[PDB]
Structures are given as structure tokens and as C-alpha cells.
Amino acid sequence: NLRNKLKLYVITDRRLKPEVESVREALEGGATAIQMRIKNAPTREMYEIGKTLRQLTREYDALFFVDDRVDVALAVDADGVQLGPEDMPIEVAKEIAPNLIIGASVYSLEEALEAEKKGADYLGAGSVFPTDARVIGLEGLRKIVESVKIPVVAIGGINKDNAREVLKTGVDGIAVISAVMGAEDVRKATEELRKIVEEVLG
Amino acid sequence: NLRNKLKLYVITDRRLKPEVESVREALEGGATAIQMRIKNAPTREMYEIGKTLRQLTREYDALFFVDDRVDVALAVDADGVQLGPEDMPIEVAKEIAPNLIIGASVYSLEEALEAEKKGADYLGAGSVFPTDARVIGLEGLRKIVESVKIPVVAIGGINKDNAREVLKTGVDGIAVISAVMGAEDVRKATEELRKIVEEVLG
Numbered sequence: 100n101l102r103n104k105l106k107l108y109v110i111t112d113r114r115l116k117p118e119v120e121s122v123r124e125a126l127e128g129g130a131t132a133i134q135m136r137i138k139n140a141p142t143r144e145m146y147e148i149g150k151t152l153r154q155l156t157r158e159y160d161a162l163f164f165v166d167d168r169v170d171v172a173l174a175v176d177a178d179g180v181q182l183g184p185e186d187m188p189i190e191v192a193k194e195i196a197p198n199l200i201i202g203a204s205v206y207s208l209e210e211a212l213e214a215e216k217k218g219a220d221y222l223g224a225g226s227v228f229p230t231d232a233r234v235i236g237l238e239g240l241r242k243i244v245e246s247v248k249i250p251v252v253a254i255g256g257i258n259k260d261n262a263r264e265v266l267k268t269g270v271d272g273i274a275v276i277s278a279v280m281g282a283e284d285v286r287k288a289t290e291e292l293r294k295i296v297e298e299v300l301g
Numbered sequence: 302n303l304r305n306k307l308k309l310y311v312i313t314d315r316r317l318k319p320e321v322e323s324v325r326e327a328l329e330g331g332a333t334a335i336q337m338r339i340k341n342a343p344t345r346e347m348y349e350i351g352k353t354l355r356q357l358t359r360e361y362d363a364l365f366f367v368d369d370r371v372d373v374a375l376a377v378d379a380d381g382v383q384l385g386p387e388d389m390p391i392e393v394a395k396e397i398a399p400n401l402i403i404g405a406s407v408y409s410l411e412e413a414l415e416a417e418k419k420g421a422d423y424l425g426a427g428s429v430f431p432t433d434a435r436v437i438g439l440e441g442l443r444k445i446v447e448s449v450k451i452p453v454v455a456i457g458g459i460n461k462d463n464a465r466e467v468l469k470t471g472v473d474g475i476a477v478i479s480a481v482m483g484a485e486d487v488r489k490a491t492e493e494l495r496k497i498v499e500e501v502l503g
């Protein structure tokens with residue numbers, strides 16, 4: 100279910116590659132979850148791209164999340180929304196969007212446990228490595244994993260050279276941006292990471 | 302109902318004045334509707350300000366709208382959302398937020414008729430005068446008024462000097478930004494406009 104489909108979590112970055120093409124390649128390569136993350140674009144544009152990503156993810160039986168924007172997630176029938184300290188409070192998103200899966204970006208053990216208490220469905224725990232400027236490291240990531248019962252996706256500076264050490268901490272998934280989106284060959288970059296995920300998680 | 306509460310429609314602009322302070326003064330001055338219009342702030346901030354303006358508007362029995370953001374409108378229990386060409390499509394907004402009043406920003410007769418057809422509850426028809434920079438003029442405003450059955454609020458370049466001529470096109474209300482938010486005394490500017498509105502519309 101959710102826990103399994105969070106294993107390889109790929110986030111868009113139009114600074115690096117256009118969303119639709121890059122998501123297609125990531126999905127070809129074995130991404131199990133996609134997050135649309137668009138910093139500054141009109142709502143209509145977010146909606147149109149979101150509709151396309153919702154179709155592609157469905158074609159590959161992948162989960163689809165939108166960063167921040169609950170309106171957009173609702174409008175495109177996304178599986179969920181990712182929420183951080185500058186976003187809609189968890190309890191409020193839950194009220195207005197009771198069927199969305201809520202991911203919470205957390206940067207400390209206190210924040211992890213609080214997000215879980217407020218009803219987050221999974222955590223994005225970071226930043227594991229330098230990339231909020233807070234860096235939790237492998238040690239901090241491991242402590243969050245040990246303390247919470249909801250799924251935990253590691254994030255922050257994760258790539259093929261460190262993915263194994265990250266996955267050894269007990270997380271359910273890794274989230275990547277640059278490692279995939281900034282690659283010369285997006286699909287191959289994703290395949291390399293998915294192999295490591297399969298190797299460590301089983 | 303809606304039609305009577307659209308008569309003096311005041312829109313925020315933090316480029317001129319902060320929202321909470323200025324909305325209090327406009328409500329004191331007789332604004333009947335307030336629209337929160339914030340560019341480039343975090344969702345958390347939009348939510349916090351929205352909650353305050355929701356409370357304020359209720360205290361003065363004024364309607365409360367949010368520009369663009371259906372998520373924010375839902376989260377703060379606003380009365381409605383205003384939607385333009387770069388925003389969520391009307392039909393989609395109605396699907397995800399079936400209890401919100403929908404205002405449509407329209408800049409032509411075709412846009413007016415299409416928005417009404419799609420189920421807009423009222424129109425923001427403009428720009429009447431120079432202040433999306435499209436200008437429709439008094440004749441274009443009148444034509445819209447003659448052609449649609451839903452309430453029409455005029456917008457764009459409106460002030461105490463041209464407000465009567467605008468009101469004589471048959472609109473249900475006037476929307477102002479600079480005339481009130483750019484005034485030295487926000488309350489007094491709003492009082493003046495409200496009087497003009499009451500005197501023409503009766």
C-alpha cells in the first residue's frame with residue numbers, strides 16, 4: 100500500500116527538466132511515487148500539468164503528490180499533498196481535504212512526532228545531507244525512524260553514492276530531486292536508485 | 302442577497318497597506334465585501350491573515366472573498382473565491398468547493414457570457430479605466446450589464462470622481478483597490494464611496 104509505494108519518491112524540478120518529460124522518464128525507470136513541486140506558476144498551469152502527471156502516474160500505478168497546494172491536489176485527483184512549516188497546517192488540510200494522503204516535511208524528532216500526532220500519513224524526514232537549513236544526518240534520520248510508526252521517507256542530498264547508507268537506517272523510502280532530475284539520463288538514474296532500494300529493502 | 306452585499310467591494314493590496322489594519326478601517330467605513338488578494342506569500346501566511354479577515358468580516362456582516370486560491374478560501378471558510386483566466390477553471394473550482402460563491406474576472410463580453418454559462422455567481426467586469434491590463438470602458442461595461450443576468454461588479458481605475466458614471470451603467474457594485482488602500486485615511490475614503498453607492502443605487 101502507501102508504505103510500499105513510497106520506496107522511490109521522485110520530486111519534479113523545472114529548473115532542471117520539464118515536468119512531463121522528466122516524470123515519464125522517472126516512471127519508465129521505476130519511480131513508485133511522484134511529487135509535483137512548482138514554485139511560482141499560475142494556478143491554471145499547475146492544474147494542467149497536474150492533470151497530465153495524474154494520468155502518467157496512473158499509467159504506471161504510481162502515487163501522485165502535490166507539494167503545498169491542496170487546491171491543486173484536489174483539482175487533479177492526486178493521491179496526496181506534502182506539507183511543510185510554510186504550508187497549510189496539517190489539521191486544516193485534513194479538514195478541507197479528508198481523502199488526501201498527507202505527507203509532512205519534518206526536520207527534527209520533535210517535528211516528526213508532532214506531525215504524526217496531528218495525523219500525517221507519512222513523513223518526509225530531512226535534510227539527511229546538506230542541500231529550512233536543518234540537516235538531521237543519518238543519526239537523526241535513524242532516531243525518527245525508531246520513534247514513529249507511520250512511514251518515513253528520507254530526503255536531502257540523496258543520490259546513488261549514499262542511498263544504501265540512508266536506506267540502512269530503516270526508512271521506508273528515499274526522496275530524490277537532483278539525483279534524478281539533474282541527470283543526463285533521467286530513466287537510467289532512476290533505475291540505478293530503484294535497484295539499490297530493492298537491494299536494501301527487499 | 303449576494304447582489305446587495307456586492308455594492309462596495311474593497312480589495313486588499315499590501316503594496317499600499319497591510320491587510321488586517323486596512324480591512325478594519327474599510328469595514329468601519331462601510332465596505333460590504335472584502336477580497337483578500339495576496340501575491341507571493343507562503344500558504345501559511347495567507348491562511349493566518351485569512352482567518353483574521355474572516356473574523357473581521359463576520360463582525361461587520363460583510364462578505365469575504367479570496368482572490369485565486371480555493372485552498373485558502375476553504376481553509377478560512379471564506380464566502381467565496383474570485384477566479385480569472387490564470388486561475389482554476391470555474392467548473393473545477395465548483396467541483397472541489399461546491400459551497401463557495403464564485404466570482405469571475407472578465408475583460409470582454411465573450412468572457413462575461415462564458416463565465417455566466419460555466420456557473421459564476423457574479424462577475425468582476427473590468428478594467429473600466431486604466432489601472433492583466435485589458436480595459437473595457439463604460440460602454441463595454443454597460444454591454445456586459447445588459448447581456449448577463451448575474452450580478453456585475455465594475456472594477457479598474459474606479460474612484461470618487463468617476464464612481465457615479467460607473468454606477469449608472471447598471472452594475473450592482475464597484476470594486477476598488479487604490480481609491481481606498483492608497484488613501485491617507487482608508488475609512489474616510491470608503492465612507493465617501495459608500496455614500497456615492499447608496500445615493501446612486503438607492
Ligand code: NI
Pocket residue numbers: 123124127286
Ligand atoms: Ni524514455
